[PDB]
Design an enzyme around this catalytic site. Structure first.
Site, PDB file in Angstrom:
ATOM      1  NE  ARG A   1      -1.033 -20.913  -6.848  1.00  0.00           N
ATOM      2  CZ  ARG A   1      -0.871 -22.090  -6.280  1.00  0.00           C
ATOM      3  NH1 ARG A   1      -0.305 -23.094  -6.981  1.00  0.00           N
ATOM      4  NH2 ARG A   1      -1.333 -22.286  -5.037  1.00  0.00           N
TER       5      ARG A   1
ATOM      6  CD1 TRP B   1      -5.287  -7.835  -8.733  1.00  0.00           C
ATOM      7  CD2 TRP B   1      -4.632  -7.890 -10.907  1.00  0.00           C
ATOM      8  NE1 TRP B   1      -6.031  -8.823  -9.365  1.00  0.00           N
ATOM      9  CE2 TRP B   1      -5.662  -8.911 -10.670  1.00  0.00           C
ATOM     10  CE3 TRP B   1      -4.080  -7.771 -12.181  1.00  0.00           C
ATOM     11  CZ2 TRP B   1      -6.120  -9.747 -11.698  1.00  0.00           C
ATOM     12  CZ3 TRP B   1      -4.540  -8.618 -13.193  1.00  0.00           C
ATOM     13  CH2 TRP B   1      -5.545  -9.573 -12.958  1.00  0.00           C
TER      14      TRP B   1
HETATM   15  C1  HEM Z   1      -2.626 -11.185 -10.598  1.00  0.00           C
HETATM   16  C2  HEM Z   1      -2.660 -10.616  -9.397  1.00  0.00           C
HETATM   17  C3  HEM Z   1      -2.058 -11.323  -8.252  1.00  0.00           C
HETATM   18  C4  HEM Z   1      -2.581 -11.334  -6.889  1.00  0.00           C
HETATM   19  C5  HEM Z   1      -3.797 -10.702  -6.259  1.00  0.00           C
HETATM   20  C6  HEM Z   1      -1.571 -12.201  -6.272  1.00  0.00           C
HETATM   21  C7  HEM Z   1      -1.686 -12.433  -4.869  1.00  0.00           C
HETATM   22  C8  HEM Z   1      -0.550 -12.788  -4.069  1.00  0.00           C
HETATM   23  C9  HEM Z   1      -0.515 -12.567  -2.606  1.00  0.00           C
HETATM   24  C10 HEM Z   1      -1.578 -11.881  -1.777  1.00  0.00           C
HETATM   25  C11 HEM Z   1       0.724 -13.220  -2.213  1.00  0.00           C
HETATM   26  C12 HEM Z   1       1.355 -13.266  -0.856  1.00  0.00           C
HETATM   27  C13 HEM Z   1       2.207 -11.995  -0.868  1.00  0.00           C
HETATM   28  C14 HEM Z   1       2.766 -11.659   0.495  1.00  0.00           C
HETATM   29  O1  HEM Z   1       2.168 -11.967   1.559  1.00  0.00           O
HETATM   30  O2  HEM Z   1       3.856 -11.054   0.504  1.00  0.00           O
HETATM   31  C15 HEM Z   1       1.378 -13.711  -3.458  1.00  0.00           C
HETATM   32  C16 HEM Z   1       2.621 -14.467  -3.453  1.00  0.00           C
HETATM   33  C17 HEM Z   1       3.307 -14.885  -4.644  1.00  0.00           C
HETATM   34  N1  HEM Z   1       2.798 -14.687  -5.878  1.00  0.00           N
HETATM   35 FE1  HEM Z   1       1.004 -13.911  -6.524  1.00  0.00          FE
HETATM   36  N2  HEM Z   1      -0.514 -12.618  -6.987  1.00  0.00           N
HETATM   37  C18 HEM Z   1      -0.827 -12.154  -8.206  1.00  0.00           C
HETATM   38  C19 HEM Z   1       0.039 -12.323  -9.362  1.00  0.00           C
HETATM   39  C20 HEM Z   1       1.267 -13.033  -9.455  1.00  0.00           C
HETATM   40  C21 HEM Z   1       2.093 -13.068 -10.685  1.00  0.00           C
HETATM   41  C22 HEM Z   1       1.836 -12.383 -12.040  1.00  0.00           C
HETATM   42  C23 HEM Z   1       3.192 -13.941 -10.287  1.00  0.00           C
HETATM   43  C24 HEM Z   1       4.361 -14.374 -11.095  1.00  0.00           C
HETATM   44  C25 HEM Z   1       4.330 -14.391 -12.447  1.00  0.00           C
HETATM   45  C26 HEM Z   1       2.988 -14.305  -8.854  1.00  0.00           C
HETATM   46  C27 HEM Z   1       3.793 -15.206  -8.070  1.00  0.00           C
HETATM   47  C28 HEM Z   1       3.761 -15.246  -6.625  1.00  0.00           C
HETATM   48  C29 HEM Z   1       4.951 -15.758  -5.935  1.00  0.00           C
HETATM   49  C30 HEM Z   1       6.201 -16.408  -6.510  1.00  0.00           C
HETATM   50  C31 HEM Z   1       4.596 -15.552  -4.557  1.00  0.00           C
HETATM   51  C32 HEM Z   1       5.395 -15.887  -3.321  1.00  0.00           C
HETATM   52  C33 HEM Z   1       6.260 -14.666  -3.096  1.00  0.00           C
HETATM   53  C34 HEM Z   1       6.961 -14.882  -1.789  1.00  0.00           C
HETATM   54  O3  HEM Z   1       7.181 -16.063  -1.407  1.00  0.00           O
HETATM   55  O4  HEM Z   1       7.290 -13.866  -1.159  1.00  0.00           O
HETATM   56  N3  HEM Z   1       1.850 -13.658  -8.312  1.00  0.00           N
HETATM   57  N4  HEM Z   1       0.607 -13.442  -4.606  1.00  0.00           N
HETATM   58  C1  LIG Z   2       4.253  -9.113  -7.524  1.00  0.00           C
HETATM   59  C2  LIG Z   2       3.048 -10.052  -7.673  1.00  0.00           C
HETATM   60  C3  LIG Z   2       3.154 -11.337  -6.826  1.00  0.00           C
HETATM   61  C4  LIG Z   2       3.018 -10.519  -9.113  1.00  0.00           C
HETATM   62  O1  LIG Z   2       1.794  -9.376  -7.391  1.00  0.00           O
HETATM   63  N1  LIG Z   2       1.069  -9.920  -6.510  1.00  0.00           N
HETATM   64  C5  LIG Z   2       0.783  -9.358  -5.333  1.00  0.00           C
HETATM   65  N2  LIG Z   2      -0.486  -8.984  -5.158  1.00  0.00           N
HETATM   66  N3  LIG Z   2       1.695  -9.139  -4.349  1.00  0.00           N
HETATM   67  C6  LIG Z   2       3.042  -9.683  -4.134  1.00  0.00           C
HETATM   68  C7  LIG Z   2       3.853  -9.016  -2.994  1.00  0.00           C
HETATM   69  C8  LIG Z   2       3.365  -7.613  -2.572  1.00  0.00           C
HETATM   70  C9  LIG Z   2       3.630  -7.297  -1.076  1.00  0.00           C
HETATM   71  N4  LIG Z   2       2.749  -8.105  -0.236  1.00  0.00           N
HETATM   72  C10 LIG Z   2       3.408  -5.827  -0.675  1.00  0.00           C
HETATM   73  O2  LIG Z   2       2.542  -5.551   0.170  1.00  0.00           O
HETATM   74  O3  LIG Z   2       4.084  -4.889  -1.140  1.00  0.00           O
END
Ligand code: HEM
Ligand SMILES: CC(C)(C)ONC(=N)/N=C/CC[C@H](N)C(=O)O
Ligand code: HEM
Ligand SMILES: CC(C)(C)ONC(=N)/N=C/CC[C@H](N)C(=O)O
Ligand SMILES: C[C@H](O)[C@H](O)[C@H]1CNc2nc(N)[nH]c(=O)c2N1
Ligand SMILES: C[C@H](O)[C@H](O)[C@H]1CNc2nc(N)[nH]c(=O)c2N1
Ligand SMILES: [Zn+2]
Lengths: 411, 407
Positions: A111, A280
């Site tokens: 974030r 990413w």
């Molecule tokens: C910019 C690069 C980003 C990285 C490295 C990042 C990283 C992550 C990671 C490592 C998780 C946990 C995913 C999992 O274990 O399945 C996650 C969850 C999440 N991210 Fe980010 N994220 C990024 C961008 C974003 C963007 C652009 C959004 C929305 C506009 C977002 C919204 C969320 C939401 C809603 C979750 C929870 C999804 C769930 O509950 O399965 N992420 N993110």
């Molecule tokens: C789609 C999103 C949250 C914006 O990008 N962020 C991210 N790094 N990953 C979100 C879910 C990816 C999932 N853990 C996977 O391994 O395919």
């Protein structure tokens, strides 16, 4: 009321007042903590307060609280709700809302980037072919030849709950899974059910270990339709290791663009049931979870074998050794191909700086420790040592049931 | 009110009913989850005693029997008369075993029924406390074949005659700040070490000095005692493949013995109740050795391995971490000192959780503490949903006695 959180490594104490603005429930009570539980059609009645809360938040963010422009907009929305029973967001409000849903996403370690989100407004979309075109555009823009750019595409909001836009895929790009008659799986076991749906709908499956799934897109409550994403738009990275030359012969690859497509975006009481967003990868998502979960590609054994580790006792830590090597390979492969990726040290260090910044400027940062701590090497990352407070702020991303469980088939 | 927990790796769903008997509060509300926060009279006492005696008589299949009623009668009499009461030996043992059973942060609870309880309620002086403690240390250590034990000192009365072990564990290493500005030994213990020195300990001023016991009997000023060196089993740390590893000069002690918690049974408070089991390898190799605020040895180890430490993305920290933890396990195993790896321990805990669900209706568990501090998702507990709640008898935190004690 103030709440304090402490980092047990640095003794930095932070004070949270933002939690006072939380409205929604957590699932916890005074008698039970549900912090590890994965998952713990509106009337005008409930709609205008939600809209008012949101527009007050928007107008405060732009230093226009209580202005004529603020008051006129509340009035306009109120009349639109009583007249039409819903309302339309201005483009500026939609942008603000989508960025805030990400800012508020307590399970998201990425974030620090929340204010740099490209919002594609797809609310003029009417058909599945239209959705396909918007999604190709998002993928090509987000991919940017490996220099990934965060983006979201937002299809029309829910109306009566009978005309929903849905992306049936859980991510825009994912590999097929196939259950074999002998009970083994080819490909990704996480996607078996969805892959069976696609086939039923008429996809001819190549039936290999990394087949990119077709999009299954529902516009306006209609039956979903299948589309193949142009292969030239799907950036993939062959996985190799910097020191182990046999690693490439495992035949592993992964896609570069993680694009969550099954969540619901709530802004001011409006419900956007199709709102694919992409950032990413953090390396562990692929190297720890996708490759090494027992219920995913499950490659630990085969890797450890190739490394000739002592596999007769768990106390050799053979799984831990193979795990680290796989994760080195994923980061090496992506970096070598100039595809954006972040390691779990960099990402968590950045999150802590983001979180401290948010406490100072915003009065809080809701965060789910269970999700924020990476799935390997937990305590050598700063987040392990950081107390967090988890609460729900709107705008927000929310889970919703899988559409095959609720869809009314037209035929 | 009836709750489901799912394992996402296996799809097994368990139904929890045990939480409905939860008494104490979690820190959480419907508005905020505090799951990751480390520390979130006569008339008071009778319901607590009743609640406890009821579960005790239930456990021995004698609920509603005369012996049950009679005991309730007798204790009521005793509270009314004396303002407190005394547990029978049988109740004390049941209570301590159950305080362990209810410990939501403990991954080792498959062992909960095999706990040797040492009744020290007849103790009156710090010297007697030292004696009981040495005996506990020797019994539990058992020449490397470790046995779980607890030693229970007399219960709180009016609160100005508290028994306390000032030490956080029976066996820990000293910490000293230097003119350098760095820290020699264990920085976790710097403050307690000063308290020892101020009380008169001649510190040998080295990296791995076993701290003296500081024992407070009967609300009196606490007193120092050295554990006989021969009762403290220590392990030099070597690696099964790296010959230089022994050059680091690392060692750890065999017996983890938490000594600063409060045992609550039937409303009675046992402020000195040191207990011990045996180590899971990660506690020493991940936390004690690699925490930035602990021995913090990752940098020195990585160097000796000649890893690329220029960039975080080489995963040099992660590589050294695995090696350090292989070396801890190897060293304890080679010296025949009980230790459990995080794979084996977590696998056992899942088996225990299923047993508890089947036989008891649930198992309070704190996911944040239960998942190991390395390789979380390759252990089965990562994928297991857990419900956290507070049952009694329990072990509770209490404030450090130097903040409380009046001299
Ligand atoms: C910019 C690069 C980003 C990285 C490295 C990042 C990283 C992550 C990671 C490592 C998780 C946990 C995913 C999992 O274990 O399945 C996650 C969850 C999440 N991210 Fe980010 N994220 C990024 C961008 C974003 C963007 C652009 C959004 C929305 C506009 C977002 C919204 C969320 C939401 C809603 C979750 C929870 C999804 C769930 O509950 O399965 N992420 N993110
Ligand atoms: C789609 C999103 C949250 C914006 O990008 N962020 C991210 N790094 N990953 C979100 C879910 C990816 C999932 N853990 C996977 O391994 O395919
Ligand atoms: C038999 C071997 C045992 C193993 C392998 C074991 C495992 C563990 C581990 C790994 C922790 C987390 C410790 C930390 O991170 O600081 C823990 C915490 C705990 N254990 Fe166990 N344990 C065992 C025996 C016991 C016994 C005998 C008792 C009580 C009689 C007990 C009660 C607890 C309590 C109360 C905590 C939480 C303490 C705190 O909050 O700091 N353990 N145990
Ligand atoms: C009974 C007892 C002391 C909890 O044993 N359990 C255990 N294995 N360790 C608990 C605390 C020890 C601490 N984590 C340490 O690494 O020194
Ligand atoms: C049961 C438990 O809550 C579940 O396995 C969670 C744990 N933490 C996680 N953390 C992330 N980032 N992603 C996940 O899928 C999970 N799974
Ligand atoms: C802030 C966070 O609660 C704190 O670092 C916890 C996390 N999980 C833990 N887990 C165990 N077993 N032991 C610990 O000391 C901690 N520390
Ligand atoms: Zn909670």
């Amino acid at each position: 009321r103030f709440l304090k959180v402490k980092n047990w490594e640095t003794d930095v104490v932070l004070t949270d007042t933002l939690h006072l603005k939380s409205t929604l429930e957590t699932g916890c009570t005074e008698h039970i903590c549900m912090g590890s539980i994965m998952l713990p059609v509106r009337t005008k009645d409930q709609l205008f307060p939600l809209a008012k809360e949101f527009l007050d938040q928007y107008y405060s963010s732009i230093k226009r609280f209580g202005s004529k422009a603020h008051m006129d907009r509340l009035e306009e929305v109120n009349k639109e709700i009583e007249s039409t029973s819903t309302y339309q967001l201005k483009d500026t409000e939609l942008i603000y809302g989508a960025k805030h849903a990400w800012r508020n996403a307590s399970r998201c370690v990425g974030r620090i980037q929340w204010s740099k989100l490209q919002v594609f407004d797809a609310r003029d979309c009417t058909t599945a072919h239209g959705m396909f075109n918007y999604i190709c555009n998002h993928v090509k823009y987000a991919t940017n030849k490996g220099n990934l750019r965060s983006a979201i595409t937002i299809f029309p909001q829910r109306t009566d709950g009978k005309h929903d836009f849905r992306v049936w895929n859980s991510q825009l790009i994912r590999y097929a899974g196939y259950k074999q008659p002998d009970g083994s799986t080819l490909g990704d076991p996480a996607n078996v059910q969805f892959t069976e749906i696609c086939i039923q709908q008429g996809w001819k499956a190549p039936r290999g270990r990394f087949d990119v799934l077709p999009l299954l897109l529902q516009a306006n409550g209609n039956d979903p339709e299948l589309f193949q994403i142009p292969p030239e738009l799907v950036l993939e990275v062959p996985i190799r290791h910097p020191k182990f030359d046999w690693f490439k012969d495992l035949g592993l690859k992964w896609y570069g663009l993680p694009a969550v497509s099954n969540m619901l975006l709530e802004i001011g009481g409006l419900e956007f049931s199709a709102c694919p967003f992409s950032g990413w990868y953090m390396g562990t998502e692929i190297g720890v979870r996708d490759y090494c979960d027992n219920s995913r590609y499950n490659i630990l054994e085969e890797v450890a074998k190739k490394m000739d580790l002592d596999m007769r006792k768990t106390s050799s830590l053979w799984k831990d050794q193979a795990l680290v090597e796989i994760n080195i390979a994923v980061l090496y492969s992506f970096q070598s191909d100039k595809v954006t990726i972040v390691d779990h040290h960099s990402a968590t260090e950045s999150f802590i700086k983001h979180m401290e910044n948010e406490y100072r400027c915003r009065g809080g940062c809701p965060a789910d420790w269970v999700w924020i701590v990476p799935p390997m090497s937990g305590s050598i990352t700063p987040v392990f040592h950081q107390e967090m407070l988890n609460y729900r702020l709107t705008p927000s991303f929310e889970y919703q049931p899988d559409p095959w469980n609720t869809h009314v088939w037209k035929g």
